[PDB]
Amino acid sequence: SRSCGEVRQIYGAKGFSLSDVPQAEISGEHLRICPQGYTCCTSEMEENLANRSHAELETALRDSSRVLQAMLATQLRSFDDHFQHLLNDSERTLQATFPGAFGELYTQNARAFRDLYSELRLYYRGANLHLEETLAEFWARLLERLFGEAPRELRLRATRAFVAARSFVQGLGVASDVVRKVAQVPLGPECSRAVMKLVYCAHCLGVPGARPCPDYCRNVLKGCLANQADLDAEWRNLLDSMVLITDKFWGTSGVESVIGSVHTGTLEKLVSEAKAQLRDVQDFWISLPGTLCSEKMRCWNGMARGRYLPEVMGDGLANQINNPEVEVDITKPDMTIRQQIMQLKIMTNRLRSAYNGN
Ligand SMILES: *[C@@H]1O[C@H](CO)[C@@H](O)[C@H](O)[C@H]1NC(C)=O
């Protein structure tokens, strides 16, 4: 008892200097973060351990962000490349059948057809948002190069198909960007305090083998990630809209059939997998506290070993007003996070609009 051996062992395994560690327990009068009591930690050790815990939590968060980003990027690239390939192969089928099938009108107008397809690619890329004018001019210089009353319907169908595809890809890209920018938001100093007291203060108070209580760590991380948790609602909204817009991919007027029919398996599986991934990460913004506590981090409640009494806080900034472990100013939001929320709102609007109308 009262020996600093084990704490010295752990503090040494951290790579830190072994000169700064006391032989036995000293007075904890000097401890700023950890509750003051007989301890094996000097102020030096306290600061060092604090820095360590903070850097570790940072690393975990950044890792989660990297995983999510990678997934969304993969989905994005997949759907984008496929949507490109459908049209490109519609053009290859075109060039294969059409000249061999019928008259010199085609072979003379071939560059005009190529320009039509290229303009459709520009429409899909979002470089040109009005296809009515470009189509009307296509028919104008096709007429002046001479295609019945129909297919004016192909205009409408291509419109509603291509806007759906573009909206889905844009959605994936936007989610990816939101995650990207939010990931660079730094942790608060009070959050760093609470985290230190969550992790290494157990070591400092003489219980180095003690495990942090689940509700305790939970409240701490809900205190730290409170701003990130505000993204929940709009995130779910965007994901819901992205799940919705894939319904337009199917049917004779469906996106697939339309992008394939411009001359007149796969995407289904991709859409299924996408649905799986999105329904997996719908919980993302509020899931972090529960995830990091259950994996990377009878029990240590922050004072001593024992039960953790306080009940777990709700998700979001405002619900942290009474947070026992960390002190949150709910009057100050993170403006970056709020901006990203706005972005989510915008893209969600675009997707809803794309779903039910013009
Ligand atoms: C579609 O055709 C264009 C013509 O330049 C080509 O560059 C592109 O590789 C094709 N689609 C894709 C993205 O593979």
Number of helices: 13
End-to-end C-alpha gap: 75 Å
Tell me the total number of β-strands: 2
Major sheet size, sense and barrel closure: 2 strands, antiparallel
Q: How many discrete domains?
A: 1
What is the N-to-C order of secondary-structure elements (H for helix, E for strand)?
A: HHHHHHHHHHHHEEH
Strand content: under 5%
Widest sheet: strand ordering:
1-2
Q: Into which percent range does the helicity of residues fall?
A: 55-70%
Structural class by SSE content = mainly alpha
Question: Which overall shape is indicated by the principal axes computed on the Cα atoms?
Answer: elongated
Q: Whole-number radius of gyration?
A: 29 Å
Instruction: Catalogue the ligands.
Output: 2-acetamido-2-deoxy-beta-D-glucopyranose
Subcellular location: Cell membrane; Endosome
GO biological process, one term: heparan sulfate proteoglycan catabolic process
GO molecular function, one term: fibroblast growth factor binding
Protein name: Glypican-1
Please explain how this structure is put together.
α2 (43-101) runs antiparallel to α3, α2 (43-101) crosses α6 and α8 packs across α12 (284-294). The N and C termini lie far apart (75 Å). It contains 13 helices and 2 strands; from the N terminus they run ααααααααααααββα. With 358 residues, the chain is mostly helical. The protein has one domain. It is 63% helix and 1% strand. The longest helix is centred in the N-terminal third of the chain and has 59 residues, at 43-101. β1 (299-300) and β2 (305-306) form a beta hairpin. A two-stranded antiparallel sheet has the order 1-2. The radius of gyration is 29 Å and the shape is elongated. 2-acetamido-2-deoxy-beta-D-glucopyranose (NAG) is lined by residues 84-85, 88. It is classed as membrane protein. The entry lists the keywords proteoglycan, glycosaminoglycans, heparan sulfate, helical bundle, glycoprotein, sugar binding protein.
